[PDB]
Amino acid sequence: DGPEKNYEKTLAILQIESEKAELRLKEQEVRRLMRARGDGPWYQFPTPEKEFIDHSPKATPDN
Amino acid sequence: GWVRPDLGQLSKVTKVKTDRPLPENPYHSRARPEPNPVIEGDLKPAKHGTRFFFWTV
């Protein structure tokens, strides 16, 4: 084939590898912020379940 | 004219009427912290696959 095919497939390969590179760097930035601040969907560490708190009137009033 | 209550009667839960207002925050609790914002939208495939080193897919 002519030189155009290899030349333009290289650009296609370059675009993919470049975009994977920036996606790889961005994930590490996201993970760092999510783990330090706990404000994202990841690194959500468990806390006690509130559905097992008893809310009934107790034997004594001041509870 | 005092009639002695029967067995079981004094242990009943009863309703009482009161002009006292209902306390609104009896525990004096603070405002709860706001939940994390939820991310919305439909799922798409991972962009360029797994992106694990040299694996293409």
Side-chain angles (χ1 to χ4, degrees):
Chain A
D1 299 292
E4 46 269 350
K5 173 167 152 160
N6 173 77
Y7 187 89
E8 289 172 327
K9 289 209 297 139
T10 303
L11 292 165
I13 292 154
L14 280 163
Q15 180 164 78
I16 290 157
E17 295 297 318
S18 191
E19 276 160 358
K20 290 207 287 212
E22 57 89 14
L23 289 171
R24 283 199 202 91
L25 293 171
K26 258 209 308 212
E27 186 198 310
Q28 294 313 292
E29 299 154 47
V30 164
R31 287 177 78 198
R32 195 199 109 259
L33 293 166
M34 267 200 223
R35 192 167 184 162
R37 306 190 292 196
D39 58 336
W42 306 338
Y43 306 105
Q44 293 299 111
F45 307 132
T47 72
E49 299 191 74
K50 73 174 189 171
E51 69 162 77
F52 295 105
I53 288 162
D54 189 23
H55 291 113
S56 315
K58 302 286 158 38
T60 67
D62 303 339
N63 317 121
Chain B
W2 291 356
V3 172
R4 201 208 198 218
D6 286 349
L7 190 80
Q9 290 198 298
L10 282 165
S11 70
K12 285 195 292 213
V13 170
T14 55
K15 66 189 182 187
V16 65
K17 271 208 300 305
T18 182
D19 286 342
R20 192 174 44 82
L22 186 64
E24 85 301 4
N25 182 23
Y27 283 94
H28 297 48
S29 68
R30 304 156 73 230
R32 303 311 187 200
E34 312 255 314
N36 291 299
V38 165
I39 291 154
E40 83 314 329
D42 321 271
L43 271 192
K44 299 288 135 67
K47 214 262 173 312
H48 309 312
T50 61
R51 306 197 290 280
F52 176 69
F53 288 100
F54 55 85
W55 275 258
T56 59
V57 283

